[PDB]
Design a protein around this ligand. Structure first.
Ligand code: 4JE
Ligand code: 4JE
Ligand code: ZN
Length: 258
């Protein structure tokens, strides 16, 4: 794998090694709020993170991931459009070089400063690897970030970034509560899509919250000081690690709210 976000290995190149990049249910997409329809068949959404067990934070050269113990039903997502139980495995963000860009999904073409992805796999498939071979294998909860007041529940993440500056670095990140990253409202849009990075697999039920969280300029500035490169290599700032909106094709976006 040599894909990235630069001019020479970015989203316009991915299809050459991952042909599904031009598939029928790719993500992200623009959410046209006027075209999205309230769906009364959606069940209440349940985010149950009270027993979440975070483990580690890692710079993988594309973003940073906070990883969780998913060997049991400790932190799960249920309800909404979902059939069954989806276990939290990791979260990460995508962000921009400037406040006016960074999100992957857009809302009426509006780009947010960043986007948080909480990644879950369908427990009926036994493990994450098997889940990504299924059309309903994954559920990703997406949350927009705008720049304004600081998000206190994000600060522990911001503070540890100095220790994972470069690709391949990791640090202990136990006892982190991901509930501190959510907005007040769970109103959402949902549609069937894909991973937004290679391998771009079409396994994801996307649940994108309507209400953004606010983070401070200082918090997002710290994200932008991370490096795509490994230690000892020329420095490339980890910024603009987002894929732009892809064709909606034969899909409808549903809203949980009237
Ligand atoms: C020297 C690496 C060149 C290169 C390899 C792979 C990709 S892709 N199709 O985005 O995975 C783009 C550029
Ligand atoms: C091995 C796949 C890892 C992975 C890639 C992309 C995503 S995302 N940006 O949430 O669609 C989640 C997990
Ligand atoms: Zn993501």
């Amino acid at each position: 794998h040599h894909w990235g976000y630069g001019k020479h290995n970015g989203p316009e190149h991915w299809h050459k090694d991952f042909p599904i990049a031009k598939g029928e249910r790719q993500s992200p997409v623009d959410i046209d709020t006027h075209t999205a329809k309230y769906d009364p068949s959606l069940k209440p959404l349940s985010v149950s993170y009270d027993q979440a067990t975070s483990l580690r934070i890692l710079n993988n050269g594309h973003a940073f991931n906070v990883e969780f113990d998913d060997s049991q039903d400790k932190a799960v997502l249920k309800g909404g459009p979902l059939d069954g139980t989806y276990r939290l495995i990791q979260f990460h963000f995508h962000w921009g070089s400037l406040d006016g860009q960074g999100s992957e999904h857009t809302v009426d073409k509006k780009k947010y400063a960043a986007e948080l992805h909480l990644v879950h796999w369908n427990t009926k498939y036994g493990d994450f690897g098997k889940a990504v071979q299924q059309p309903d294998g994954l559920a990703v909860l997406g949350i927009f970030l705008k720049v304004g007041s600081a998000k206190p529940g994000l600060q522990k993440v911001v503070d540890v970034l100095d220790s994972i500056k470069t690709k391949g670095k990791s640090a202990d990140f136990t006892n982190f509560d991901p509930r501190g990253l959510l907005p007040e409202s769970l109103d959402y849009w949902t549609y069937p899509g894909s991973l937004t990075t290679p391998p771009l697999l079409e396994c994801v039920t996307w649940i994108v919250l309507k209400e953004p969280i606010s983070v401070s300029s200082e918090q997002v500035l710290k994200f932008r000081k991370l490096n795509f490169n490994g230690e000892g290599e020329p420095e490339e700032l980890m910024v603009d690690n987002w894929r732009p909106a892809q064709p909606l094709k034969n899909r409808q976006i549903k809203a949980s709210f009237k």
